[PDB]
């Protein structure tokens, strides 16, 4: 149930508007990696690989969440973004 719903809102996240904040994109990435891989064990990327360094930092920030806890928070975050975009369009 939880895993099948997490996969469902992973597809829904692909149809999210690009106007969402960079912070929300980093939140969703960190939650997605934390739910599927778990806490990050890769070394931090290089000081000039900034695109991967911010993705790593966002993943590092949610290292305390369990895999199922991260699945539920990821679903919740995608839900909040879908219903907020629906309240902004006609």
The answer to whether 55 is annotated as binding is yes
- Which residues touch 67 (CB under 8 Å, ≥6 apart)? 34, 35, 36, 38
> Encoding tokens for residue 35?
């739910």
Tell me phi and psi for residue 23, to 5 degrees. Answer: -60, -45
Resolution at which this structure was determined, Å: 2.3
Residue ranges of domains in the chain: 1-90
Q: Which CATH architecture has domain 1-90?
A: Up-down Bundle (1.20)
Give me the sign of the Cα torsion angle 51, 17, 4, 76.
Answer: positive
The span from the CA of 70 to the CA of 35, in Å, is: 5
Contacts of 45 (CB under 8 A, 6+ apart): 52, 53, 56
Q: How was this structure determined?
A: X-ray
The DSSP-derived string for 7-71 is: HHHHHHHHTS-TTS-HHHHHHHHHHHHHHHT-S--SPPPPTT-HHHHHHHHHHHHTTTS-HHHHH
Residue 30 marked ligand-binding: yes
| 59 vs 43: CA distance, rounded Å | 12
Is 14 annotated as contributing to ligand binding?
A: yes
67 marked as binding residue:
no
């Amino acid at each position: 149930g939880l895993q099948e719903e997490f996969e469902e809102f992973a597809e829904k996240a692909k149809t999210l508007p690009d106007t969402i904040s960079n912070e929300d994109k980093l939140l969703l990435y960190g939650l997605y990696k934390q739910a599927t891989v778990g806490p990050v064990t890769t070394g931090r990327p290089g000081i000039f690989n900034l695109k991967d360094r911010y993705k790593w930092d966002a993943w590092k920030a949610v290292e305390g969440k369990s895999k199922e806890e991260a699945m539920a928070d990821y679903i919740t975050k995608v839900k909040q973004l879908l219903e907020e975009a629906s309240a902004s369009t006609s």
